[PDB]
């Protein structure tokens, strides 16, 4: 009956410390198996993109906050800003699948943060490396990436996203990851079929040319009747006697469902293998270390930093 | 009788000065029934000026009442005209370098249209429905400096002849405008310090940015009052389904005082004095006449809706980094 | 005793001596005397000391009336006299005879302030009394909570506040009508005279909302068939002769009121539907849709039985444009 101990945990661990320094505590949670999913989280700074993953990996739809594994804001908000998750976190659920709740791109707490106290000119200019560092990051070594949203078509999100595949060192064909597209806090529009309709004309047209398998598995799992009206991609949103105790209407599906129905298509979601092996979790931590070092000191940066 | 047009309304040959105060409303926007800027003006002059139902597609409207002159810009940030935008790159009119020059001349073009609320303009609002301030706009105001400066002559030598005054043509806008942000809710005593904590974080990063200088800089600091509404938490139609559900069983200035309190500054001439650092305290009211506003806007949009402005775009290099990295 | 009151004048014997006040005469004067003077941190705690300690009939009083220096230090003091007279309840010193008129003076002198004043002298006033009525504090009241605040510059909530000042007040004077008369007198002289000018819209709509003012509490008598020639007085005025785009928002709302009388016995209601089928003229303002909509609900109310044809037939495209997303509009059309 020992012959099969497994492993838990219990709270997040961050690889990427707040001065964006690799750490070592998560090989004491790997293990040697071969397929190892790896979704990450990009987001703006209120976007709500450690709900997601903390909804997704072990905690569900109804659960206290502070017990999920990655904190999420609840004194944060009204107080200064936000910006709670400093650096890039770590998990395994029981299933094996690894979760990265990076930092708020382009966030104004952590400019904040660098204005009060490094090798850059301006902390502007900075936020913005430490951005691409994490897309880079999360594109080389993630099996997807969850593009949480507050709200709809951020087009600086586009530009971004855009840019960070021009920083993705290749060469260890060019690996690139999946983009899931969470709208979180989606009203009720958003579940309509012409706003889907324009949503996903939308997203296709501004990532036209990304190169990221951003469409084919989702988007169909909770609707009406709808036949494929438009290009379906990757889009999955997420919402924010007998007579008298009828619910308001609320115009999308519960929380609970499309909570269940994202943490079914994450686990599903398609692991290809990564750049050149097997990479086994424990080669995988061993494979997402030695990208830390060569994208914090690679030439893309390096370059951009001067453009800026 | 008011008609809610900018390129209309500056094609004019009543109310002929008003002691006027014109407002910009810029800002990214959801997809949604209402847009934040119409339901801002709106909201503002207490009427439904906007009812409900690939450019920037700038339009103005003028408020009796109160004697100030909305521009609301739809810059292609916004996702109503970037729908359109989309909708005519699916179809009809390209490869990837074709759509990322599209998508740069577009940038342009608002970048364009932003300037000249900048450049005619007294208080500027911006909109953001994510309650966090966007870094981005900050290499954007720092993109605007450059076009606000160099594209400063190819100004000043097209409202020459202009009643606008000595300090308009002197530093090519009426008075420094200030920014007011305006944040809408989306989960939350508790908005009051998430405005001071807005507000003090903006003011650091324009300040560590340049953003905003001690003299007249394209912005102004607006230290004394405040630069940041948080709207509450409606716009779709959920009010009648919502009152179903009862037809069946059977401080914190709103809109209003907020922004008077920054236009009250500029209807009784008080001005935009607001600098910190024993300056010079150049502080010009310059408080303009609807016939002498839209004498200095119609020149004003004519240079830049341009001979060389067009060929100051290239100037920019904050914005387009991505075709020079490529 | 006397010490506590010199401690009274840093705040630790201050606090100190307020607890004596549960339990002499010197400290009547006091606090209105030190409150006045000090700051205004520690201004309320003394106007609250002295108002626990004895019945105060001519004693806290006097001095309240001669605090003309400034006016929070009258505000404050007459605080003084309406917490005792709220405290008493004996009815010696208590919205009294003659002396009271010193509270009268200051009802005259209270228009002069932004309303800070009437904040709480006016709302204590009725009741203050139980046993003796006065008819004549109506009129002085509403000599300034209509006229100095049609247009005190907002004078936005003052003629609400007021509003109650009636309600609690005109449950007597059974002959109530004296007010409407001396308002619409010189209503239909300010209607039909002169041209569009500010001064006239702003009297005219002043008188307007007097009009719903007084009418909100005079429902007792009698009404012998005036309600009908007040609806025709108030309807000629503004039907044709403005005919100018000012605020019809008081002017819609008169009519709501004046007709609220009456269920379905009889009307002109005939020459009601040009009022208010003219009045949707878009757009403006988002209330004065509210306060047009409003008299749609009104003719409804009386179109019991006898209304019919073109009537609902201009319900097609003209008022269904006022269902944006004002939710005050959306629920009053
Ligand atoms: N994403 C999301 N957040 C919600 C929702 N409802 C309330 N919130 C609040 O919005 C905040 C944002 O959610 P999080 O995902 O936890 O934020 P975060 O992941 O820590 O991202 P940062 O703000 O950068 O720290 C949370 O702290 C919640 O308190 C919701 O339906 N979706
Ligand atoms: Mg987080």
């Known amino acids: 009956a020992k012959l099969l101990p497994p492993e838990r945990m219990k709270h997040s661990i961050k690889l990427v410390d707040d001065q964006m320094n690799w750490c070592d505590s998560a090989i004491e949670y790997l293990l040697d198996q071969t397929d190892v999913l790896v979704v990450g989280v990009l987001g703006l700074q209120g976007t709500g993109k450690s709900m997601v993953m903390s909804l997704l990996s072990a905690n569900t739809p109804e659960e206290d906050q502070r017990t999920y594994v990655f904190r999420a804001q609840s004194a944060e908000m009204k107080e200064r800003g936000g910006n709670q998750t400093s650096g890039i976190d770590f998990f395994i659920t029981q299933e094996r699948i690894v979760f990265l709740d990076t930092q708020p791109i382009l966030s104004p707490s952590i400019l904040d943060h660098l204005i009060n106290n490094p090798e ?25 990436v969850i593009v949480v949203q507050d709200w709809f078509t951020d087009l600086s999100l586009y530009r971004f996203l855009q840019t960070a595949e021009m920083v993705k060192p290749s060469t260890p064909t060019e690996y690139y990851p999946h983009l899931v597209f969470l709208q979180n806090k989606a009203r009720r529009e958003d579940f309509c079929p012409r706003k889907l309709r324009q949503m996903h004309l939308m997203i296709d047209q501004l990532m036209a040319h990304s190169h990221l398998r951003y469409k084919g598995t989702l988007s169909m799992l909770q609707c009406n009747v709808f036949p494929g009206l438009p290009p379906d991609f990757l889009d999955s949103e997420v919402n924010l006697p007998l007579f008298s105790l009828l619910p308001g209407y609320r115009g999308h599906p519960s929380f609970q469902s499309l909570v269940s129905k994202l943490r079914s298509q994450v686990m599903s979601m398609a692991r290809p293998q990564l750049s050149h092996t097997i990479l086994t979790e424990k080669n995988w931590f061993h494979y997402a270390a030695r990208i830390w070092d060569g994208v914090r000191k690679s030439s893309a940066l390096a370059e951009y930093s001067r453009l800026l | 009788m008011a008609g809610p047009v900018s390129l209309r309304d500056l094609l004019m040959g009543p109310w002929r000065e008003d002691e006027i105060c014109v407002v910009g409303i810029f800002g990214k926007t959801a997809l949604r029934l209402n847009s934040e800027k119409f339901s801002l003006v709106n909201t503002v002059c207490d009427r439904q000026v906007f009812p409900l139902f690939d450019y920037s597609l700038l339009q103005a409207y003028y408020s009796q009442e109160s004697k100030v002159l909305y521009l609301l810009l739809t810059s292609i940030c916004d996702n109503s005209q970037l729908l359109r935008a989309c909708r005519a790159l699916q179809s009809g009119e390209l490869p990837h370098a ?52 160099k594209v400063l002559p190819l100004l000043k030598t097209a409202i020459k002849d202009c009643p606008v005054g000595k300090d308009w043509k002197l530093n090519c806008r009426p008075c420094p405008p200030r920014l007011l942000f305006l944040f809408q809710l989306n989960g939350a005593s508790p908005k009051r310090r998430l405005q001071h904590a807005l507000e003090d974080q903006i003011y650091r990063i324009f300040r560590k940015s340049r953003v905003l200088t001690n003299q007249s800089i394209n912005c102004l600091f ?76 119609s020149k004003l949009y004519e240079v830049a809706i341009s001979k060389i402005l067009s060929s100051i775009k290239v100037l920019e290099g904050f914005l387009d980094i991505d075709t020079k990295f490529s | 005793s006397a010490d506590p009151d010199n401690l009274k004048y840093s705040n630790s014997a201050v606090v100190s001596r307020q607890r004596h006040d549960d339990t002499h005469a010197d400290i009547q004067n006091d606090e209105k005397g030190g409150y006045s003077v000090n700051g205004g941190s520690g201004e309320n705690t003394y106007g609250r000391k002295s108002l626990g300690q004895e019945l105060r009939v001519n004693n806290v009083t006097s001095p309240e009336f001669t605090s003309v220096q400034h006016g929070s230090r009258a505000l404050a003091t007459k605080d003084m006299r309406k917490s005792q007279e709220r405290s008493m309840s004996y009815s010696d010193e208590s919205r009294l005879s003659n002396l009271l008129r010193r509270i009268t003076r200051e009802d005259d002198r209270d228009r002069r302030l932004a309303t800070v004043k009437q904040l709480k002298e006016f709302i ?151 009022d208010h089928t003219q009045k949707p003229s878009l757009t403006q303002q988002v209330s004065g849709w509210l306060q047009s909509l409003e008299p749609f609900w009104v003719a409804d109310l009386a179109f019991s039985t006898t209304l019919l044809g073109q009537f609902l037939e201009d319900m097609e495209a003209y008022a269904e444009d006022l269902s944006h997303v004002a939710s005050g509009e959306s629920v009053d059309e």
């Open chain 1, 120 to 144: 850059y000119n301006l902390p502007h200019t900075y936020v913005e490396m430490q951005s691409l560092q994490i897309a880079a990051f999360l594109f080389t070594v993630c099996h997807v």
């Open chain 2, 98 to 149: 074709e759509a990322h020059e599209f998508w740069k001349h577009q940038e342009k073009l608002q970048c364009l249209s932003l300037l000249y609320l900048f450049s005619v303009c007294h208080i500027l609002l911006l909109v953001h429905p994510t309650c966090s301030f966007d870094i981005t706009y900050d290499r954007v105001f720092r993109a605007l400096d450059g076009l606000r400066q």
């Open chain 2, 222 to 297: 607006t230290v004394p009052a405040n630069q940041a509404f948080v709207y509450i938490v409606e716009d779709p139609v959920g009010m009648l389904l919502d009152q179903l559900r009862s037809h069946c069983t059977v401080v914190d200035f709103t809109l209003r005082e907020f922004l008077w309190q920054h236009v009250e500054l500029v209807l009784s001439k008080k001005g935009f004095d607001d600098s910190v650092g024993r300056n010079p305290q150049p502080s010009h009211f310059e408080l303009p006449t609807y016939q002498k506003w839209i004498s200095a806007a």
């Open chain 3, 124 to 274: 204590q006033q009725p009741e203050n009394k139980l046993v003796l009525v006065k008819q004549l504090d109506n009129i002085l009241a509403a000599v300034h909570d209509v006229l100095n605040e049609s247009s005190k510059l907002l004078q936005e909530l003052r003629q609400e506040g007021a509003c109650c000042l009636g309600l609690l007040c005109a449950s007597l004077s059974y002959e109530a009508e004296k007010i409407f008369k001396w308002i619409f007198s010189k209503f239909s002289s300010s209607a039909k005279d002169e041209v569009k000018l500010l001064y006239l819209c702003a009297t005219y709509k002043a008188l307007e909302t007097v009009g719903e003012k007084k009418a909100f509490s005079s429902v007792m008598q009698l009404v012998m068939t005036s309600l009908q020639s007040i609806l025709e007085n108030v309807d000629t005025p503004e039907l044709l002769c403005k005919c100018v785009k000012c605020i019809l928002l008081v002017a819609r709302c008169y009519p709501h009121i004046f007709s609220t009388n009456f269920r379905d016995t009889v009307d002109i209601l005939v020459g009601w539907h040009i």
